[PDB]
Amino acid sequence: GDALRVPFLDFATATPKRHQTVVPGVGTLHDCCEHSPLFSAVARRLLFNSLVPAQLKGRDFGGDHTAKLEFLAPELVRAVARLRFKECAPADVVPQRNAYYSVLNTFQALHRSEAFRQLVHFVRDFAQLLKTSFRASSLTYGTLELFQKMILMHATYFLAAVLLGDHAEQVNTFLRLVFEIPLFSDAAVRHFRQRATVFLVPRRHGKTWFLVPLIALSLASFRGIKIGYTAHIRTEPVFEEIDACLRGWFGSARVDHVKGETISFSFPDGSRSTIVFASSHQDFNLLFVDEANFIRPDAVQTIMGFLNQANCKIIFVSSTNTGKASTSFLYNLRGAADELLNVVTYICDDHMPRVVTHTNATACSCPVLTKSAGERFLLYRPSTTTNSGLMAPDLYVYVDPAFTANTRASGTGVAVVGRYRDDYIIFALEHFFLRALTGSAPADIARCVVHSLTQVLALHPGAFRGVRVAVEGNSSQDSAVAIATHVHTEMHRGPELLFYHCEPPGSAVLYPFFLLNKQKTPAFEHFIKKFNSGGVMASQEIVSATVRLQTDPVEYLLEQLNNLTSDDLMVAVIMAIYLAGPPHT
Amino acid sequence: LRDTIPDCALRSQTLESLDARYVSRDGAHDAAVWFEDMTPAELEVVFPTTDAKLNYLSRTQRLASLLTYATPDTACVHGELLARKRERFAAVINRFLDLHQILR
Amino acid sequence: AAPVSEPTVARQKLLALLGQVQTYVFQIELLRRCDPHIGRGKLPQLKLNALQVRALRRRLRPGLEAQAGAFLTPLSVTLELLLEYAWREGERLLGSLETFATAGDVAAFFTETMGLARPCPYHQRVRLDTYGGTVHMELCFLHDVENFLKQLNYCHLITPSRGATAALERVREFMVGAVGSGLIVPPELSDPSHPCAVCFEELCVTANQGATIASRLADRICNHVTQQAQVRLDANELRRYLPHAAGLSDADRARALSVLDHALAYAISELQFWLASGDRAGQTTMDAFASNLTALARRELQQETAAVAVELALFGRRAEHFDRAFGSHLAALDMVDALIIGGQATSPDDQIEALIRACYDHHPLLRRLVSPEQCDEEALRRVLARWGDIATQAAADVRERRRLYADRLTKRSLASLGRCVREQRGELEKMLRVSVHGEVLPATFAAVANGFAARARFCALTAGAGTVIDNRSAPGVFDAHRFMRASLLRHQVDPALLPSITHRFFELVNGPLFDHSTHSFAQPPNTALYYSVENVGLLPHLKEELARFIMGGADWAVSEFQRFYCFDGISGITPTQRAAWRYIRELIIATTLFASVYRCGELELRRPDCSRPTSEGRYRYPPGVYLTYDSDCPLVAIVESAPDGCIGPRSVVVYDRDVFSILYSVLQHL
Ligand SMILES: Nc1ncnc2c1ncn2[C@@H]1O[C@H](COP(=O)(O)OP(=O)(O)O)[C@@H](O)[C@H]1O
Ligand code: BEF
Ligand SMILES: [Mg+2]
Ligand SMILES: [Zn+2]
Ligand SMILES: [Zn+2]
């Protein structure tokens, strides 16, 4: 502690008292200096940089300071020591001095809190024991893995808020500094304060190499705080290891334990914190559940009951194998949860994103559309029948035909879309399967699309001046033309009907089909960008005759879309939207 | 330790002349780091709080950053960013209202 | 215990001076919107303050100049930015107020100061100028400066010193104009959808329910380079503050309060064009939002009328600020353009509350919204415990599919619904609330300039002080280099040592920004490099060639005789990095083999980016063979420096371009 013992620095100023504020360490400044995080986060860190002990600055930090926060050049300090302010207002000097010294006295009183001395004796002792990689030293390095630091943060930010409640902001900032993670949004640090967090480490990555030092140092540093612990197969190795390390780097006269049961660490007082083991089956404050994929009933009840307490943080650190990665007890929890469980995985969701997290693997052991956009897409649907004023007066329909039956890729995709504000909305979807050996496949497909259109038209009467129809002809030009002809004729029983036309290479003829080639990549590229930013949605009253006996049409479309890296519906939807050169009558 | 405001007090004397005559002189000592108070009184009767003053200072900034992007640069990628941000916020607020209209 | 180290008092004085300068640059950003007839009244104060800043950045100019060349610090960077921007804006505002009273025009003065006709001064070029080609980008936004700084930290092992200092100066010259205000961060340069370097560091660390981190950096608003500052403003603000105004005669104050009491006695019409689903007739949420916005408009207009009346009473002149002199361009904006900017008498928090008091009303889902902690708690509890016919059929299926859709929205998908509603609320708050600034840009700028200036300072500081026996000029150094090469190309790598080479390799390929290995809670160089490599989006076909670059009589003799750190032949940013990795792996394996064959001494293969300065101007470069990343003098071996550590009269060093020449000269001198 050096920056807390600084004199007044008279430092007169012109701002009225109705505005000025008192920042610690420095004198009284105008109120704007408390709103700008450019100066606030500097005048707040150069002070808390003194509470941080000398064993938590780093490996190479400077001689006797955190040289990357408090370093003035040997010429700037000599040029600054010759700066002098107004120094005074005789009627106003005493109140400002009183306020500054009162804030600094609040800080100094925070420095002397026994509960803060315990937190220091914890974090400093941890960063010191870690220098030897947690050997049996009585008290080439022992770097922590990522999750082996997340567990420490989850324990320390909790025990800080529990043991030191009257210093929430100051201890929050002190821990932000001591973990060397400043300028962290308070939402994350608040998330660290939560209880009942779940970990999932692969075996042989190190979970017991780090727990028993965490347990030992959360015992010996803090006072009067118990520590729960439970496992299925009767914890004996971890218990004996805790005994060993505690008797090693502390007086063995202090530790007292009965095999497979309570371990207790002595103190000058009668604090006597305990590690009572719940493996063999009050206030615990840790309850380190060491295995959470193998529990037997009537043992989950103690864990469900300790959740009713306000001081326990049940840490579900449990190993995985990747041969049973989808644990019947935890990996399902990731479905309905929010910042609860954090997996430690190096082969992520897909079969091989391993190259991404490859450098992240331990050295000792040697999706085009975003999910959020998909969830937002299916989750929110606009009601088109009641917001018709937001729609453009043109419908665009794309038909991606397959002219076979009794195959899984024999489905015909149909999409009916339009503009909604400046976005795109789907009015209808079909995934249509020819009846085998019909004599009229084009008319069957045409009847399908006409039925879809009609329903869309009836749901929004008078909304549309034009419907523009594209029939993909890649499969068969003649068959595509036949579909257009039947659509043309059937629709003849208001909105004008126009077909996209194509002049095939070497031809002068304009056929009512669409040839998908060079425009595919631009269409897909635009769709992906629009979809991901929330610009493509489905009508709340979306129409589908063919997706009405097994699955929700929007849900079904999204399953096809999530294959981007049977595609008839995806292609029809993406192309109908791309359409929304001139097509004609 | 004589202050700069009780050092020079006279007619316009364009700023560089003052710099030349008073502070750039090497024979000076350069004490008196006391600033002055430049915010007027007609701006405190209507915005009588650093919070209200900051809110007004931000409102006028958000307006100026709209007037400049509304000779034919015509792209000014800041302008395209400011149009994309507005067209995103419009859709986002509309869907935030519509979703809670639907939740009932 | 009485005397405190003089650097501490100097730092406190600098903090006070930074606060004063920030206050001054706030008064400046106020007088840029005030009526010119009042700027002319505050002209002497502004001139005095401009003189003060001028005389101030001359007592600190040599100091800050020496500081920039030796271990920059966030305090010094912020002070430099604020001093320079305050000087700039002081001179500009004084010039624009003295231009006024020659034209007598207010609209012209406002188009000048607030910059309504300036040609977009937020463009800049860098010209990184690495080896193997000079890649140049263009800083436009703030996240672009952040991306460039991370890119420089990543490709730090190729760019030379002076090129990096030039690029960093051309970046600081843009930060002076962007981060110079430090208080309002104009919206022309801010894209919160782009996550900065700390969003990744706090997404790796927080919970990740599956959801590979690359899939979470798309929804984040990043909340760090532009904060929110949560401004709050009372309803009867001026009436609370008019009785106790400063420098007002009691009679004038009384009649002003009388005029106030007497005078106290948006584009809502464009809401129907918004896509409003649900029932059309009845109490809906769009009508509630319209009523809330109408109430807020009433409050703001009432406050404005009261302010005009009280100004007519006190001073007698209806002042013309930037919201009353440009009221023509205002009051004509659409609903969204009035929501984004507006409310000089309300606060963006009042708009948020006026929207949310309309959304959340009279309703399961609200319980999950108000307290997600209890929601995850009950989730964990549950887990532990366990043509005519066409029209009619269209109506019927749309009925039975709206029913099913509502049933899903009430029963399932509640995780997705909660997440989406929270994210929409965040995207609203980040847009409305007043973005002030962030503390990420000066931090990263200092962290990168520190490493580069440290490399330059070591290159310049080991110049003399003793014998400087150089091996870049080769009299016969071939004879002693090829011998050592053949003597080290003979032994095996002894894979029992690979867990040390794989660490002392990533400890050199890393950058100076992401320490993550000297935190005293150090993480291995694996993650310390995974940060500096994944942040700057790297091709996955290159990320595996970092990890698997040591698993494998060649491949540790890839250097030529004299050209070890020389990329004369190759060009690009990926192949230059590959050759750099080859040369660094070669140096590491050569050092390891030299230790495993000869027992002369230790080398420890240190880097100049370390050795932070002490309380004053002391560096104490320890003995060892450094890398120095300098194609003009790559290898510098300090065989023995001094009893204290600093490079003194007995600090004989050995320059060399040739790794094996260094490994032989070390043995000869030790
Ligand atoms: N980052 C690391 N720091 C320290 N030890 C590590 C690290 N990574 C791996 N280890 C080693 O891994 C082992 C830890 O295994 P352990 O946690 O007992 O496995 P399990 O998860 O199956 O219980 C120890 O030998 C330890 O030295
Ligand atoms: F990796 Be183990 F628990 F055998
Ligand atoms: Mg084991
Ligand atoms: Zn521009
Ligand atoms: Zn960010």
Map C533-576 to HEC letters. Answer: HHCCCCCHHHHHHHHCCCCCCCCCCCCCCCCCCCCCCCCCCHHH
> What are C597's two structure tokens?
């064959």
A partners (3+ CB pairs within 8 A) are: B, C
Amino acid at A338: D
Walk across the sheet containing A255-257 and list its strands: A255-257, A263-265, A273-274
Mutate which: A30, A42, A198, vs C, most C CBs within 10 A: A42
Element (H or E) spanning A473, and its range? Answer: none
At residue A342, φ and ψ (nearest 5 deg) are -130, 110
Query: A117-343 domain in CATH 3.40.50?
Result: yes
Number of Cβ within a 10 Å radius of residue C208: 21
Please give, rounded to a whole number of angstroms, the shortest distance from the CA of A385 to a CA of chain B. Answer: 14
Distance A343 CA to ligand 1 centre (A): 17
Q: In 3D, which of A72, A291, A56 has the Cα closest to residue A180?
A: A56
**A428: three-class secondary structure by DSSP:** strand
Tell me the ligand closest to C141's alpha carbon.
4
Q: Of all atoms in ligand 2, which is nearest to the CA of residue A203?
A: 1
What does the block give as tokens for C590?
Answer: 């050569």
Q: Is B15 in Cβ contact with C50 (below 8 Å)?
A: yes
Q: What contacts C321, CB < 8 A, 6 or more positions away?
A: B43, B60, C33, C34, C35
Please list all protein residues whose beta carbon sits less than 5 angstroms from ligand 4, which is an ion.
B 76, 78; C 120
Resolution in A, one decimal? Answer: 4.5
How far is it, in rounded angstroms, from Cα C333 to Cα C516? 49
Interface residue A335 vs chain C (CB under 8 A): yes
Distance from CA of C208 to the nearest CA of B (A): 26
| Burial class of residue A508 (count of CB atoms within 10 Å of its CB; 0-12, 13-18, 19+) | exposed
Which residue bears the tokens 């496949």?
A441
- Count of other CB atoms within 10 angstroms of residue A323: 5
**Does residue A203 have its Cβ closer than 6 Å to ligand 2?**
yes
* CATH of the structural domain A375-579, one choice from 2.30.110.10, 3.20.20.70, 1.10.3720.10, 3.30.420.320: 3.30.420.320
Q: How far apart are CA C429 and CA A451, in angstroms?
A: 45
Is-catalytic flag, A559? no
Measured from the Cα of A210, ligand 1's closest atom is 17
A208 in contact with ligand 1, CB cutoff 6 A: yes
Q: C575, C533, C564: which is closest to C633 by C-alpha?
A: C564
* Closest partner CB to B78 (pick from C140, C240, C355): C140
**Experimental technique of record:** cryo-EM
**Identity of the amino acid at A576:** A
Structure tokens at A515: 């040839």
Contacting residues for C495 by C-beta, under 8 A, at least 6 apart: none
Alpha-carbon distance of C127 to A250, in angstroms, equals 58
Residue A413 carries which DSSP code?
A: E
Alpha-carbon distance of A93 to C95, in angstroms, equals 37
CB of A418 closer than 8 Å to CB of A427: yes
User: In 10 A of CB B96, how many CB atoms?
Assistant: 22
Place of tokens 């990747």: A322
Subunits in contact with chain C (3 or more CB pairs closer than 8 Å):
A, B
CA–CA separation, B25 and B45 (whole Å): 41
Query: What are the backbone dihedrals phi and psi of residue A272, each rounded to the nearest 5 degrees, phi first?
Result: 55, 65
> Domain-by-domain residue ranges, chain A?
21-112, 117-343, 375-579
Name the residue type at position A319.
Answer: S
C247: alpha, beta or left? (left if phi > 0; alpha if psi -120 to 50): left
CB contacts, 8 Å: C229 with chain A: 35-37
- Residue nearest (by alpha carbon) to ligand 2 atom 2: A203
User: Which residue, among B23, B30, B38, would best test binding to C if mutated, counting the most C CBs under 10 Å from its CB?
Assistant: B38
Q: Which residues contact C295 (CB under 8 A, 6 or more apart)?
A: C354
Q: A540 CB near a chain B CB, below 8 Å?
A: yes
Q: Is C5 annotated as a binding residue?
A: no
- Taking the Cβ of residue A543 and every Cβ of chain C, the question of whether any pair is shorter than 8 Å is answered with yes
C9 is in an annotated binding site: no
Tell me whether residues C51 and B53 touch, CB distance under 8 A: no
Distance CA C296, CA C644 (A): 70
Q: Running DSSP on this structure, what letter comes out for residue A519?
A: T
Amino acid identity at C618: R
Give the span between the Cα atoms of C354 and C477, in whole angstroms: 80
Closest CA to A249 of A119, A130, A117, A118: A130
Question: Per the CB < 8 Å rule, is B38 touching C31?
Answer: yes
**Cα C619 from Cα C623, distance rounded (Å):** 12
**Beta-strand runs (E) in A211-314:** 229-230, 255-257, 263-265, 273-274, 288-289
Which helix (H) or strand (E) segment is A320 a member of? strand A315-320
Helix (H, G, I), strand (E, B) or coil at C485: helix
Largest CA distance in chain A: 106
Q: Which atom of ligand 2 is nearest to the CA of A204?
A: 1
Q: Does A535 touch chain B (CB under 8 A)?
A: yes
Kindly write down the DSSP assignment for every residue of C151-179, as one continuous string: HHHHTTTTS-HHHHHHHHHHHHHHHHHHT
Give me the residue label for tokens 């103690």: A302
Distance of alpha carbon C331 from alpha carbon C347, whole angstroms = 18
* Residue (of A291, A143, A408, B1) closest to C507 by Cα position: A143
A496 is annotated as an active-site residue: no
Length, in residues, of chain C:
670
Residue nearest to atom 4 of ligand 1 (CA): A142
**Closest C-alpha to ligand 1, atom 6:** A206
Residue at token pair 């509350």? C353
Q: Is A358 part of the contact surface with chain C (CB cutoff 8 Å)?
A: yes
C586 and C558 in contact (C-beta within 8 Å)? yes
Residue of C nearest to B93 (CA): C428
Q: A364 and C523 in contact by Cβ < 8 A?
A: no
Q: Are A146 and C523 in contact, with CB atoms under 8 Å apart?
A: yes
Q: Which residue has the tokens 């970990």?
A: A199
In short, whether A143's Cβ falls inside 6 Å of ligand 1 is: yes
Residue length of chain A = 585
Q: Which residues of C602-629 are buried (b: 16+ CB within 10 A; e: fewer)?
A: ebebbbbbbbbbbbbeebebbbbbbbbb
The number of C-beta contacts closer than 8 angstroms across A and C is: 438
Q: How many Å apart are CA C55 and CA B30, to the nearest integer?
A: 7
Nearest CA owner, ligand 2 atom 3: A203
Neighbours of C245 (CB within 10 A): 17
Nearest-Cα residue of chain A relative to residue C211: A349
Tokens matching residue C433: 């609330």
Catalytic residue among A243, A290, A394, A568: A568
CA distance B85 to C69: 40
Inform me whether the C-beta atom of residue C429 falls under 8 Å from chain B C-beta atoms: no
Nearest-ligand number for the alpha carbon of C197? 5
Q: Please tell me the distance between residue A332's alpha carbon and the centre of ligand 2 in angstroms.
A: 23
Vertex A578 angle, CA A576 and A583, to 5°: 75
Tokens of A264: 């207790």
C-chain residues near A11 (CB < 8 A): 16
Tell me which residue of C167, C386, C432 sits closest to C293, measured CA to CA.
C432
CA–CA distance, C550 with C568 (Å, rounded to integer):
25
> Helices C161-178 & C441-461, crossing angle to 10 degrees?
150
- A567: helix, coil or strand? coil
Phi-psi sector, C465: left (phi>0), alpha (psi -120 to 50), beta: left
Alpha helices in A272-369 (DSSP H): 300-306
Per-residue DSSP letter, A391? B
Among A417, A434, A433, CA closest to A425 = A417
456-495 of A, contacting C, C-beta below 8 A: 458-459, 493
C348-359 vs C285-314: helix axis angle to the nearest 10?
Answer: 150
CA dist A429 and A416 (Å) reads 7
Comparing CA positions, the residue from A514, A447, A512 lying closest to residue A481 is A512
Give the relative orientation of helices C250-263 and C285-314 as an angle to the nearest 10 degrees: 150
> C8: which 2 tokens?
């501490």
Are C226 and C142 in contact, with CB atoms under 8 Å apart? yes
Distance separating alpha carbons of residues C286 and C361, to the nearest angstrom: 12
CA distance C45 to C22: 16
Per-residue burial over A154-174, b if 16 or more Cβ lie within 10 Å, else e, is: bbbbbbbbbbbeebeebbbbb
Active site residue A291: yes
Residue C529, both tokens: 């490099």
> Coil, helix or strand for C584?
helix
Which ligand is closest to the CA of A290, given by its number?
A: 1
Phi, psi of A502 (to 5 degrees): -140, 135
Going by alpha carbons, the residue nearest to atom 15 of ligand 1 is A206
From CA C58, how far away is CA C61, in angstroms rounded? 5
The sign one gets for the Cα dihedral C251, C253, C254, C255 is positive
Catalytic site residue from A125, A290, A394, A400:
A400
As a whole number of angstroms, the distance between CA C34 and CA C41 comes to 11
Span from the CA of C206 to the centroid of ligand 5 (angstroms): 15
Cβ atoms within 10 Å, residue C292 = 18
Contacts 24+ apart (CB under 8 A), C119-125: C119/B73, C120/B68, C120/B73, C120/B76, C120/B78, C121/C177, C122/B78, C122/C174, C122/C177, C122/C178, C122/C188, C122/C189, C124/C170, C124/C171, C124/C173, C124/C174, C125/C170
Contact of B50 with chain A, judged by CB distance below 8 Å, is answered with: yes
Nearest atom, ligand 1, residue A206 CA = 17
Using alpha carbons, select from C377, C375, C353 the residue that is nearest to residue C364. C375
**Alpha carbons A188 and A164: distance in angstroms, whole number:** 19
Domain spans in chain C, listed from the N-terminal domain onward: 1-118, 130-227+436-456, 229-362, 365-423, 462-493+552-669
Angle, helices C43-56 vs C74-99, to 10°: value is 140
Please report the beta strands in C194-329, taking only residues with DSSP state E, as ranges in sequence order: none
Ligand 2 centre and the CA of C383: distance in Å? 25
Beta-carbon contacts of residue C326 (< 8 Å; ≥ 6 apart): B63, B67, C107, C110
Residue A193's nearest CA partner among A157, A164, A152 is A157
Distance from CA of A561 to the nearest CA of C (A): 16
Residue of B nearest to C257 (CA): B45
Give residues with Cβ within 8 angstroms of C655, minimum separation 6: C468, C469, C470, C471, C472, C633, C635, C636
